[PDB]
Design a protein around this ligand. Structure first.
Ligand SMILES: O=C(O)Cc1ccc(O)cc1
Ligand SMILES: [Ca+2]
Lengths: 557, 195
């Protein structure tokens, strides 16, 4: 998910501009739900995933808010000591404590029911047990017992009118999430929210700890430790799920890293390129970053250095010259199925070869498979989420940086060979593979574009629509599932705020029993594809002026 | 009027709710959610509680067990039981609003029942505050805030220890899965603060 907030000093023809692109995957019907709430302290407009009570994206006329997932480490695993004799017990602080337990029956349509038991300890639910070692793993979340309060914080923040009021609610949001602020006076802010454990000295948060008592967390760190910044010297806040701050540790996921190679740099280069940005230019960054190859920037200098002493008729050099002329923006041909330049296909094959020779080679099976992906892997329906830089490519980037990388190279990933020899062998592999399928004339290579599917199954893999309700878009775009833009104090209007969004396929997913589809079932789908947007209304006058219908209810509690 | 809820939809069908107190406000919200996205919401509810195999069968029994293994329902009910009356109103309002539209749908299914209920053979059920809270827990806290690979990390570490020996295995582990890397591009500039 990406976000760019532009404040007073960087904005052109407004005091503040917020553009959010939450990336949750693409679904039919739409992942978020549009809703305006006017009464009982509330005066809000925006859209929110699964119609939560609190609007994750929107504004109240004074301030605006947005989110990106967080990825701090707020979950650790406690290895609990069981006993062969006295089962259902576990050792904690010198006594054998009994487990909480519950029985569950799964009713099955056209099958027998199934019952099983769920176990829990002071640390959390038991994930798995090792009977051989008499160990059980408990997953322990820092937000445990604060789920409901996190939902309420997201609701109550819609009423804040300033920084102070807003951070009071951000302090109560316990999940690891980045929250962003903007207001009518042009102030902008950021908080990496959530509850983080206050761990005992010597606790490596990447691996399990014994659950017998000595490693228990001491409590939670205060909200003053949460990374946060208000009205930054730079004039802007940008995030693509990238590290909040210097020295902040990331999730313990093996596939997740905050390294020198990061896709947020792509947003930074565009915001640093212009002294000020208009609303229309802030919206335009969606289109550039959607189409940008993320590996070009990283490995072009290495490819250039290695093929510098090569002759012009050397195919490995021809591949690098193609890359050197490319700006890295993918564009569809007229056929609607192939890209105009073969760049991504070349980097994809190269990178796959480079990892097989370097990172993959140093890691024992079967963990070598964790580091092979190039990051271009999709299927015919296209990627299920955002495109990113793969773990293996982030590890390889540190290795090609030499002693300019801060990460000690315990193993030489090039295994004694000069870098350029490994780079050139991979480039030979790339030429062999691609020329075999497209031939030797690089200029007529028509490589396959990625496409985009609005899926009928939700993110769990469960149907939320019939399979024919699936929608297909020819151009894959690395962009938010929805895009929303709030512009405060526009010099070009008399309105204090102006906001836009796009919620595809449509606001409604209703289909009558005779198969008649709602009028608002898919009236936002072409708008999505062409980077368009619709206005969000807040004031009464604007809502009346664009009203298409009205319904009044009289109800007493 | 304290009993009135006015629902205005715009040109794109986006509902705006006008109401005077908490419970009427969120009752309106739930009511238009039930009008626009009932089948989606119903599948989400089953997804987040692990009750998919009841309407969809044997292919979803593992899924349902995995969902129930990952939370503790009594803990969620206890948090709901401690809300103040104002906070409780948000959740109850919303479930009541849904229930109002689900009542008319189950009363006039020939015109009001979403096609996919007939297709998949089952009908909507009434909601309580616990169901509203489990939508958010299930799809926000468990999708984006529950990530850990600590057990797999230890299996990698052990394997690097066997291949490169004890100290060397650890130093390779920090090469592949570093704790922090000081060159990472950050949202906060170093001039403002550091962890
Ligand atoms: O960034 C993500 O992975 C999705 C996400 C976006 C916004 C948010 O608040 C939580 C999760
Ligand atoms: Ca951890």
């Amino acid at each position: 998910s990406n976000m760019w907030v532009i404040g007073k000093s960087k904005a052109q023809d407004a005091k503040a501009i917020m553009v959010n692109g939450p990336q949750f995957g693409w679904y039919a019907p739409a992942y978020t739900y549009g809703i305006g709430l006017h009464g009982a302290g509330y005066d809000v407009t925006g859209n929110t995933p699964f119609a939560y009570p609190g609007l994750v994206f929107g504004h109240n006329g004074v301030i605006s808010w947005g989110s990106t997932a967080g990825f701090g480490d707020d979950v650790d695993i406690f290895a609990e000591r069981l006993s062969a004799e006295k089962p259902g017990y576990y050792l904690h602080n010198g006594k054998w404590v009994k487990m909480l337990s519950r029985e569950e029956t799964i009713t099955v349509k056209n099958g027998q029911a199934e019952t099983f038991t769920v176990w829990r300890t002071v640390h959390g639910n038991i994930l798995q047990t090792d009977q051989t070692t008499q160990t059980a793993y408990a997953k322990s979340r820092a937000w445990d017992g604060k789920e409901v309060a996190s939902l309420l914080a997201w609701t109550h923040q819609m009423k804040a009118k300033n920084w102070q009021q807003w951070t009071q609610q951000a302090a109560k949001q316990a999940l690891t999430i980045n929250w962003y602020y903007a207001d009518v006076n042009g102030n902008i802010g950021y908080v990496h929210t959530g509850a983080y454990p206050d761990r005992q000295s010597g606790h490596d948060p990447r691996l399990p700890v014994p659950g017998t008592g000595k490693w228990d967390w001491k409590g939670l760190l205060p909200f003053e430790m949460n990374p946060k910044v208000y009205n930054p010297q730079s004039g802007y806040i940008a995030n693509w799920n990238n590290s909040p701050q210097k020295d902040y540790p990331a999730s313990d996921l093996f596939a997740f890293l905050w390294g020198g190679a990061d896709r947020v740099t792509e947003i930074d280069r565009l915001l640093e390129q212009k002294p000020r940005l208009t609303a229309d230019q802030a919206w335009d960054v969606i289109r550039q970053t959607s189409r940008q190859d993320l590996n070009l920037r990283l490995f072009l200098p290495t490819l250039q250095a290695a093929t510098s002493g090569l002759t012009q008729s050397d195919p490995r050099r021809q591949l690098v010259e193609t890359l050197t002329r490319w700006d890295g923006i993918n564009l569809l041909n007229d056929d609607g199925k192939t890209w105009q330049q073969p760049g991504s296909a070349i980097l994809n094959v190269w990178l796959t070869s480079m990892l097989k020779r370097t990172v993959v080679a140093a890691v024992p099976m079967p963990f070598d498979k964790w580091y092979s992906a190039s990051g271009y892997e999709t299927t015919q329906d296209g990627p299920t989420g955002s495109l990113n830089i793969s773990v293996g490519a982030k590890i390889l980037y540190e290795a090609v940086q030499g002693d300019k990388s801060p990460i000690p190279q315990a193993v030489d990933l090039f295994a004694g060979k000069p870098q350029q020899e490994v780079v050139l062998a991979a480039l030979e592999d790339t030429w062999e593979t691609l020329s075999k399928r497209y031939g030797n004339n690089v200029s007529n290579w028509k490589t396959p574009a990625m496409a985009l599917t609005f899926r009928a199954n939700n993110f769990f893999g469960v149907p939320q629509a019939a399979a024919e309700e699936t929608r297909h878009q020819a151009e894959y775009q690395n962009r938010g599932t929805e895009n929303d833009m709030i512009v405060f104090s526009p010099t070009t209007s008399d309105r204090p705020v102006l906001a836009w969004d796009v919620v595809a396929p449509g606001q409604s997913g209703f289909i009558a029993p005779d198969g008649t589809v709602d009028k608002h079932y898919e009236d936002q789908l072409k708008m999505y594809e062409n980077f368009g947007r619709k206005s969000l209304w807040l004031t009464k006058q604007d809502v009346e002026a664009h009203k298409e219908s009205q319904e009044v209810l009289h109800v007493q509690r | 009027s304290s009993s009135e809820i006015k629902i205005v939809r715009d040109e794109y069908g986006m509902p705006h709710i006008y109401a005077n107190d908490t419970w009427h406000l969120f009752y309106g919200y739930g009511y238009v959610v039930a009008q626009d996205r009932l089948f989606q919401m119903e599948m989400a509810r089953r997804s987040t509680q692990g009750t998919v195999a009841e309407v969809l069968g044997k292919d979803f029994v593992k899924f349902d067990k995995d969902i129930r293994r990952n939370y503790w329902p009594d803990a969620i009910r206890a948090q709901i039981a401690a809300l103040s009356p104002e906070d409780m109103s948000i959740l109850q309002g919303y479930a009541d609003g849904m229930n109002a539209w689900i009542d008319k749908v189950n009363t006039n299914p020939e015109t009001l029942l979403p096609k996919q209920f007939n297709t998949f053979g089952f009908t909507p059920k009434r909601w309580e505050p616990f169901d509203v809270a489990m939508i958010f827990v299930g799809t926000m806290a468990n999708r984006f805030s529950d990530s850990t690979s600590e057990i797999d990390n230890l299996a990698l570490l052990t394997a690097l220890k066997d291949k490169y020996g004890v100290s060397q295995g650890m130093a390779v582990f920090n090469q592949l899965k570093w704790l922090v890397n000081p060159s990472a591009p950050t949202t906060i500039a170093v001039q403002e603060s550091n962890y």
